Design an enzyme around this catalytic site. Structure first.
Site, PDB file in Angstrom:
ATOM      1  N   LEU A  37       0.836  -1.204   0.000  1.00 10.11           N
ATOM      2  CA  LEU A  37       0.000   0.000   0.000  1.00 10.11           C
ATOM      3  C   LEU A  37       0.877   1.262   0.000  1.00 10.11           C
ATOM      4  O   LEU A  37       1.955   1.261   0.588  1.00 10.11           O
ATOM      5  CB  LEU A  37      -0.925   0.002   1.223  1.00 10.11           C
ATOM      6  CG  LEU A  37      -1.897  -1.185   1.398  1.00 10.11           C
ATOM      7  CD1 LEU A  37      -2.761  -1.012   2.659  1.00 10.11           C
ATOM      8  CD2 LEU A  37      -2.784  -1.371   0.164  1.00 10.11           C
ATOM      9  N   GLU A  96      -8.702   3.803   7.863  1.00 14.26           N
ATOM     10  CA  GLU A  96      -9.096   3.124   6.636  1.00 14.26           C
ATOM     11  C   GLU A  96      -9.002   1.609   6.836  1.00 14.26           C
ATOM     12  O   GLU A  96      -9.908   0.876   6.458  1.00 14.26           O
ATOM     13  CB  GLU A  96      -8.228   3.569   5.455  1.00 14.26           C
ATOM     14  CG  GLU A  96      -8.959   3.567   4.095  1.00 14.26           C
ATOM     15  CD  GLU A  96      -9.262   2.165   3.589  1.00 14.26           C
ATOM     16  OE1 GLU A  96      -8.358   1.302   3.670  1.00 14.26           O
ATOM     17  OE2 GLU A  96     -10.401   1.917   3.130  1.00 14.26           O
TER      18      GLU A  96
HETATM   19  N1  NDP Z   1      -5.298  -0.105  -1.934  1.00 15.15           N
HETATM   20  C1  NDP Z   1      -6.026  -1.212  -1.850  1.00 15.15           C
HETATM   21  O1  NDP Z   1      -7.367  -1.156  -1.474  1.00 15.15           O
HETATM   22  C2  NDP Z   1      -5.373  -2.527  -2.200  1.00 15.15           C
HETATM   23  C3  NDP Z   1      -4.176  -2.504  -2.897  1.00 15.15           C
HETATM   24  N2  NDP Z   1      -3.522  -3.656  -3.217  1.00 15.15           N
HETATM   25  C4  NDP Z   1      -2.230  -3.545  -3.921  1.00 15.15           C
HETATM   26  O2  NDP Z   1      -2.232  -4.172  -5.189  1.00 15.15           O
HETATM   27  C5  NDP Z   1      -0.928  -4.661  -5.470  1.00 15.15           C
HETATM   28  C6  NDP Z   1      -1.070  -6.141  -5.793  1.00 15.15           C
HETATM   29  O3  NDP Z   1      -1.791  -6.232  -7.017  1.00 15.15           O
HETATM   30  P1  NDP Z   1      -1.253  -7.120  -8.233  1.00 15.15           P
HETATM   31  O4  NDP Z   1       0.219  -7.028  -8.307  1.00 15.15           O
HETATM   32  O5  NDP Z   1      -2.096  -6.838  -9.415  1.00 15.15           O
HETATM   33  O6  NDP Z   1      -1.512  -8.615  -7.760  1.00 15.15           O
HETATM   34  P2  NDP Z   1      -2.820  -9.396  -7.254  1.00 15.15           P
HETATM   35  O7  NDP Z   1      -2.984  -9.233  -5.790  1.00 15.15           O
HETATM   36  O8  NDP Z   1      -3.980  -8.931  -8.042  1.00 15.15           O
HETATM   37  O9  NDP Z   1      -2.401 -10.893  -7.602  1.00 15.15           O
HETATM   38  C7  NDP Z   1      -2.161 -11.271  -8.947  1.00 15.15           C
HETATM   39  C8  NDP Z   1      -1.970 -12.773  -8.954  1.00 15.15           C
HETATM   40  O10 NDP Z   1      -3.219 -13.414  -8.733  1.00 15.15           O
HETATM   41  C9  NDP Z   1      -3.301 -14.595  -9.518  1.00 15.15           C
HETATM   42  N3  NDP Z   1      -4.459 -14.472 -10.430  1.00 15.15           N
HETATM   43  C10 NDP Z   1      -4.823 -13.373 -11.164  1.00 15.15           C
HETATM   44  N4  NDP Z   1      -5.980 -13.659 -11.815  1.00 15.15           N
HETATM   45  C11 NDP Z   1      -6.334 -14.930 -11.505  1.00 15.15           C
HETATM   46  C12 NDP Z   1      -7.423 -15.710 -11.861  1.00 15.15           C
HETATM   47  N5  NDP Z   1      -8.337 -15.245 -12.716  1.00 15.15           N
HETATM   48  N6  NDP Z   1      -7.533 -16.983 -11.358  1.00 15.15           N
HETATM   49  C13 NDP Z   1      -6.576 -17.488 -10.500  1.00 15.15           C
HETATM   50  N7  NDP Z   1      -5.499 -16.702 -10.155  1.00 15.15           N
HETATM   51  C14 NDP Z   1      -5.387 -15.442 -10.642  1.00 15.15           C
HETATM   52  C15 NDP Z   1      -1.968 -14.744 -10.231  1.00 15.15           C
HETATM   53  O11 NDP Z   1      -1.181 -15.475  -9.306  1.00 15.15           O
HETATM   54  P3  NDP Z   1       0.019 -16.434  -9.767  1.00 15.15           P
HETATM   55  O12 NDP Z   1       1.130 -15.572 -10.319  1.00 15.15           O
HETATM   56  O13 NDP Z   1       0.501 -17.245  -8.578  1.00 15.15           O
HETATM   57  O14 NDP Z   1      -0.487 -17.374 -10.824  1.00 15.15           O
HETATM   58  C16 NDP Z   1      -1.472 -13.313 -10.288  1.00 15.15           C
HETATM   59  O15 NDP Z   1      -0.063 -13.165 -10.393  1.00 15.15           O
HETATM   60  C17 NDP Z   1      -0.062  -4.422  -4.230  1.00 15.15           C
HETATM   61  O16 NDP Z   1       0.695  -3.228  -4.422  1.00 15.15           O
HETATM   62  C18 NDP Z   1      -1.085  -4.187  -3.145  1.00 15.15           C
HETATM   63  O17 NDP Z   1      -0.602  -3.309  -2.152  1.00 15.15           O
HETATM   64  C19 NDP Z   1      -4.043  -4.886  -2.856  1.00 15.15           C
HETATM   65  C20 NDP Z   1      -5.269  -4.942  -2.188  1.00 15.15           C
HETATM   66  C21 NDP Z   1      -5.932  -3.755  -1.834  1.00 15.15           C
HETATM   67  C1  QLZ Z   2      -5.547  -2.466   5.486  1.00 15.40           C
HETATM   68  C2  QLZ Z   2      -6.882  -2.401   4.726  1.00 15.40           C
HETATM   69  C3  QLZ Z   2      -6.666  -1.813   3.343  1.00 15.40           C
HETATM   70  C4  QLZ Z   2      -7.889  -2.009   2.400  1.00 15.40           C
HETATM   71  N1  QLZ Z   2      -8.757  -0.997   2.284  1.00 15.40           N
HETATM   72  C5  QLZ Z   2      -9.834  -1.073   1.463  1.00 15.40           C
HETATM   73  N2  QLZ Z   2     -10.700  -0.083   1.412  1.00 15.40           N
HETATM   74  N3  QLZ Z   2     -10.053  -2.147   0.711  1.00 15.40           N
HETATM   75  C6  QLZ Z   2      -9.209  -3.182   0.748  1.00 15.40           C
HETATM   76  N4  QLZ Z   2      -9.428  -4.242  -0.026  1.00 15.40           N
HETATM   77  C7  QLZ Z   2      -8.114  -3.139   1.612  1.00 15.40           C
HETATM   78  C8  QLZ Z   2      -7.245  -4.251   1.701  1.00 15.40           C
HETATM   79  C9  QLZ Z   2      -6.546  -5.196   1.754  1.00 15.40           C
HETATM   80  C10 QLZ Z   2      -5.653  -6.333   1.850  1.00 15.40           C
HETATM   81  C11 QLZ Z   2      -4.522  -6.021   2.808  1.00 15.40           C
HETATM   82  C12 QLZ Z   2      -4.732  -6.189   4.190  1.00 15.40           C
HETATM   83  C13 QLZ Z   2      -3.689  -5.927   5.086  1.00 15.40           C
HETATM   84  O1  QLZ Z   2      -3.855  -6.117   6.433  1.00 15.40           O
HETATM   85  C14 QLZ Z   2      -5.253  -6.440   6.720  1.00 15.40           C
HETATM   86  C15 QLZ Z   2      -2.458  -5.497   4.603  1.00 15.40           C
HETATM   87  C16 QLZ Z   2      -2.257  -5.310   3.231  1.00 15.40           C
HETATM   88  C17 QLZ Z   2      -3.300  -5.572   2.342  1.00 15.40           C
HETATM   89  O2  QLZ Z   2      -3.152  -5.402   0.997  1.00 15.40           O
HETATM   90  C18 QLZ Z   2      -1.845  -4.897   0.635  1.00 15.40           C
END
Ligand code: NDP
Ligand code: QLZ
Ligand code: MG
Ligand code: MG
Length: 225
Positions: A23, A30
């Site tokens: 993140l 949040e």
């Molecule tokens: N700000 C927020 O609310 C959030 C932000 N994030 C951020 O997003 C970033 C991560 O995103 P990203 O890099 O896109 O990776 P993802 O978390 O989206 O994971 C991608 C992986 O998921 C697997 N995958 C993708 N599609 C499929 C499918 N259709 N079926 C089965 N497996 C699948 C593959 O794994 P494999 O390679 O093993 O095959 C792929 O490499 C981080 O920076 C994180 O901090 C994450 C959650 C929340």
């Molecule tokens: C820490 C809440 C942020 C968050 N906020 C919102 N509005 N949606 C989400 N989907 C996530 C999320 C997520 C997954 C997540 C959880 C975490 O500790 C629990 C640490 C890193 C994470 O992603 C890098």
């Protein structure tokens, strides 16, 4: 039959969500919202599901995973099947789409899942625009003094706005009954877009909890036997 809800925190105006596997910010309030929304249910006898990509899973602190009190599903193309229990609280799936179908079976799920939250992957969100019934989006804005963080992963805002409308008027009603939010519903212009939802400020940022809902669809075809 079970609502599918994407939930994400995104920095306006590009809707950046991540940098280098983590993140771009650390906001306890949040984090609290995310925890409470994904955990809490209106029906005490149900849980929610949280579905995530492998890379998002690997980035959650190890002491914090699996996310307590929710069914965790991790998707990776290298996993074995559509929906497989691998440990207490942890399912593996090799398919986002097939895992949703499997989770939706009343036979498998005993109608004891209330909602399915898709909690990320950038890559996972990209594939979820056509799967989600709603999005809960925390819209984050740096306050005037605040440096914009570097970001390399983004929510598809174009696809969002094609398919969904800002339904934040209904956010409060939509959230689990026992959640309590600080803000009141507010509409603010920010760099030439309307930002509507429930406001919070923490560290360098102001953010709004918002709800997006699928736009009405015309009736072109209904399958008949
Ligand atoms: N700000 C927020 O609310 C959030 C932000 N994030 C951020 O997003 C970033 C991560 O995103 P990203 O890099 O896109 O990776 P993802 O978390 O989206 O994971 C991608 C992986 O998921 C697997 N995958 C993708 N599609 C499929 C499918 N259709 N079926 C089965 N497996 C699948 C593959 O794994 P494999 O390679 O093993 O095959 C792929 O490499 C981080 O920076 C994180 O901090 C994450 C959650 C929340
Ligand atoms: C820490 C809440 C942020 C968050 N906020 C919102 N509005 N949606 C989400 N989907 C996530 C999320 C997520 C997954 C997540 C959880 C975490 O500790 C629990 C640490 C890193 C994470 O992603 C890098
Ligand atoms: Mg497996
Ligand atoms: Mg798939």
């Amino acid at each position: 039959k079970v609502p599918v809800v994407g939930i994400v925190a995104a920095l306006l105006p590009e809707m950046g969500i991540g940098f280098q596997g983590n993140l771009p910010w650390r906001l306890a309030k949040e984090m609290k919202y995310f925890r409470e929304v994904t955990t809490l249910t209106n029906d005490n006898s149900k849980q929610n599901v949280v579905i995530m990509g492998r890379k998002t899973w690997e980035s959650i602190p190890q002491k914090f995973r699996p996310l307590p009190k929710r069914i965790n599903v991790v998707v990776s193309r290298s996993f074995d099947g559509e929906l497989r229990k691998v440990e207490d609280g942890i399912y593996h799936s090799n398919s986002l789409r097939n895992c949703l179908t499997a989770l939706q079976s009343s036979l498998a799920n005993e109608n004891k899942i209330e909602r399915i939250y898709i909690i990320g992957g950038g890559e996972i969100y990209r594939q979820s625009m056509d799967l989600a019934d709603h999005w809960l989006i925390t819209k984050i804005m740096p306050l005037p003094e605040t440096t914009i963080p570097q970001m390399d992963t983004f929510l598809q805002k174009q696809e969002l706005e094609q398919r969904f409308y800002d339904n934040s008027d209904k956010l409060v009603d939509f959230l689990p009954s026992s959640i309590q939010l600080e803000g009141r519903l507010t509409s603010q212009e920010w760099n030439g877009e309307l930002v509507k939802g429930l406001p919070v400020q923490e560290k360098g940022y102001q953010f709004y909890f918002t709800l997006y809902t699928k736009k009405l669809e015309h009736h072109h075809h209904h399958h008949h036997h």
